[PDB]
Symmetry: D2
Subunit: 123 residues, 4 copies
Amino acid sequence: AEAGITGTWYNQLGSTFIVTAGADGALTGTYESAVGNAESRYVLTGRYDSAPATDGSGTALGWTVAWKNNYRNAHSATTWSGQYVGGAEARINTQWLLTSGTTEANAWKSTLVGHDTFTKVKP
Amino acid sequence: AEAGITGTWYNQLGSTFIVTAGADGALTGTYESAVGNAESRYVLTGRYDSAPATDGSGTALGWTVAWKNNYRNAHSATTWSGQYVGGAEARINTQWLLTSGTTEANAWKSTLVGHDTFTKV
Amino acid sequence: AEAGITGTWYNQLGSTFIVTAGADGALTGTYESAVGNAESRYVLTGRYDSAPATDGSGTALGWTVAWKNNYRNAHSATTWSGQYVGGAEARINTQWLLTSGTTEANAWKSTLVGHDTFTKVKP
Amino acid sequence: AEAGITGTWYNQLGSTFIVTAGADGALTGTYESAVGNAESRYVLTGRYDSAPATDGSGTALGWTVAWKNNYRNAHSATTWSGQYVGGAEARINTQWLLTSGTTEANAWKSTLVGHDTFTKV
Ligand SMILES: O=C(O)CCCC[C@@H]1SC[C@@H]2NC(=O)N[C@@H]21
Ligand SMILES: O=C(O)CCCC[C@@H]1SC[C@@H]2NC(=O)N[C@@H]21
Ligand SMILES: O=C(O)CCCC[C@@H]1SC[C@@H]2NC(=O)N[C@@H]21
Ligand SMILES: O=C(O)CCCC[C@@H]1SC[C@@H]2NC(=O)N[C@@H]21
């Protein structure tokens, strides 16, 4: 449900995700991270399943942030892959990969993995 | 300057990734997977570092495909996160997460992880 | 602390982890999964940092279960990588990789990733 | 039978993995990393499927190294999870998780993920 996803969300670190779900499956918005080499808002773009299953399955989605805006550039990008689970206590449960640009010799330690849970604030 | 990310790329499974890199960091294009519950092309969108470091570092990037088009809907989405390494034989090295829409009970087994290497050959 | 790790632990799915931490850095024990193609106990072996930092850092550890015992064989193995965080509310926070044996053509979808949090029961 | 997992293997970074596979599923040996905060050999222990499927499937396995030995202590541990594929050119294909001991504040950045391919060359 585009309107189910569309809104302001926060995760367990205190980061803010503002997203709009388009009817063609597009996600666009901004992300503000509470941690890491980041300041202010960053552009995000992603995609979601705009026709999910009618049962109690979640809606699969994903989005990317490259950590460069007009104030800072961390030379890194994170992708979040997860699912939206609707209802009263709407949640988006994700796992993420954060890759930093590195020299070829340091490429083995270029990528962090983690997981974030997002809670929606009253839309 | 010199981000030769724009083009048609192929990974080791034979999937085709056609991307345009915008001057301000946007990635847009289409993806056609040679494997999985997929047929024909799917829309992708992503982001990349449009001013990378001047030392020998790769360019960080990432993108998403939701596997729904006019033919099929797999109820899943993949994100690739990696770096572009330019040069005479340019490559995009990625790790990816493929999440399927599941019930809560099956959420523990909702996400596959793998790694794809893209070259222009 | 070997004695800090040693004990019975349960995660959010209802699975049971019984572990003994050896003074040489060895972990041995048994694992019972509440989900998946598993029944009864399975042998686990792992390693941990037996001399962690004296600050508030966690103790890094990891262990493996191959899902074959005398009752069932799922032809898969999981490795958990994480850290033990001591105290009153002792926790082990992990991420895991579950690989299934597959044919070469299905090898792209061989591995699941997830995360489990373990709580210790009164030792 | 035929699990030719036992031996000395090398990955793409030039690290050396010396393993013995026990008849009942145990893996034991040593690991020497060519990269990272590591020197000399470290103890590894793991598990593998000692009765794999009879179709063309690989053998699932996994092992752990805690990066402490008599020389150094990195306060970290790596787990590799993968499958052994036998044949004329046998390979072990893995994905790994490297967790460092961190404070709670830094737990979000405690875990690296990568992938190693081992061959006997
Ligand atoms: O340090 C960087 O390279 C950029 C900031 C990264 C912030 C990460 S993205 C995953 C995790 N979730 C968050 O909300 N913030 C951190
Ligand atoms: O089966 C699905 O759910 C949709 C197709 C998934 C194809 C995956 S995405 C990661 C990997 N890289 C590819 O080029 N194809 C597979
Ligand atoms: O289905 C299988 O192949 C074997 C059982 C797998 C159980 C997994 S391991 C990770 C997760 N944590 C658990 O406690 N159980 C599941
Ligand atoms: O730096 C550390 O914390 C200890 C050494 C880590 C070496 C890693 S483990 C994964 C990868 N594969 C290797 O052979 N070496 C690196």
